[PDB]
Every structure is written in C-alpha cells, then in structure tokens.
Amino acid sequence: RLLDELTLEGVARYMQSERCRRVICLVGAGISTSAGIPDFRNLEKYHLPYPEAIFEISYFKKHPEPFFALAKELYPGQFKPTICHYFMRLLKDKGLLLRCYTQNIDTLERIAGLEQEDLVEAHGTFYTSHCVSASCRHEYPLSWMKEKIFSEVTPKCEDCQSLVKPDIVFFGESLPARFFSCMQSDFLKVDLLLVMGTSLQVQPFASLISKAPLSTPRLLINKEKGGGMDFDSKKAYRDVAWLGECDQGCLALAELLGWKKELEDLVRREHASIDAQ
C-alpha cells in the first residue's frame, strides 16, 4: 500500500514523496476533445454495413472514401494542445515522465513538447502518410494529405497508383514494434500510472495497466469510470477515480501539487506561440 488514502489528495501527496520518481501516462480521446477533436467512438450516403467499418482496415482498403469524407468534416482549424497535454509536459520537465502511451493520432503530445523518446504513439499518427504497397511505400507529408482531403480526391500514390493512407493504425492492423518493446521495459518498474481520457476499450492498449507492478498506484481522470481498475470494493487499495473533463482534472491535481501557476503560465505562453504562427 503506497497511497495513504484513495483520493486525489492522496495521489498528490504520493507524487510529492521521494518514492514517486517515474510516471507513465496512458491517454485517449478525452484529452483532445477540448482541442476541437471529437471522440471517434453526413456519412449516410455511403451506406456503411455498420458504423465501425469506417476505421476497419479491410473495409478502408477497398472503400476509402467514407474515411476521407469524415477526415474533411473533422479536420481542426488549428493544432493546439490542451491543459492535459501541458500537464504531461510539466511531468517531462520535472524528470517524472517515464513514457506517454497515446491512443490518439492528432500529434498534440508532440506539439506540447513531448519528444519522440517520451512517446509511444500506439495507434500511429496522422502527421505522415504512406502508399500501402510494400514494394513502394512512398511517403507523403501532412500538407499533401490535407490537400487531398479538402479537395475530396482520394489519396493515390503518384508512382504505383496504390492507396495512400495516413500512418494511423486502423482496427485490424498490427501495432508498431515500439509499443511492444517499450511495454516490456516500462511496466517492470514504474511508480504511478496516470490514465486520462480513455475508457480502455481498445486492445491491446487496454491491457497495459495490468502490466504494472501490483503496488503501483493508478489514477483515472475521465468522464466515466476495461483495464481492471478497482475503485470501490472493500478490496480497493491503489486505484483512484476523478470524474469529469481531463483539463479540469489536471488543473485540480496541479493545484494540490502547487503547480497551478506553473501550468497556467505554460499553457498561456505556448498557446500564444501557436496563435502567433
């Protein structure tokens, strides 16, 4: 038992102790909704067999148009990380971030200042794109992909005529080797798991929190309570839930840590920088 009490205050006290040196963040769609990117969990014209087919690789490869139509509708006017992203930046700068495992493809962790080595982009990224042909794999940048999306021309390889897709992991695709490589090391020794903006419904990402040592405390910051968390039973000993929006949860935790001013300054200067671009 490493937490004195199963509360946000208990987690904050623990984070301040010398015991808490290494923190893994596990994040999903809920950390980016306030950045104007909706939770993926006008397409009627395509008569999809079921709504989920939009993100399945087998369906996508033969009928890519519905996906790219959705991409146009939901493409943000700007890429601006949230308070929650900047909380993770604070963890990084304070030497507390072992890794951020993300389910998101929006690049906002990168923009917030998390480096390549800080991240496991478990579901890939929208930032880069590639031809699907293994013998070709021609790369295309975001500007090229965005132009195809907005002009409603299906991305096609200029060399081999094959489909070009963003470097996202569609349902039914393998996760990157980096995911499994980092998982095998990071969860052997970690002091805290910070689970934010995910209901842990997607595998094998959902399985990650079970990989931590049994003594590792785990804080959930999410709108609602499949990872194997136990908050409420008489056997509860290490898991804490804070229910609401991720920005507000991170602000509450930062205030308890005495980081409220530091966080708000960081958000405001970084937002100013992005707006001045």
Partner: peptide, 7 residues
C-alpha cells in the same frame, strides 16, 4: 505482431 481490436 498483435492487432488493434475492440471498436
């Protein structure tokens, strides 16, 4: 390598 499932 293991695949993305559960959507």
């Amino acid at each position: 390598l293991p695949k993305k499932t559960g959507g």
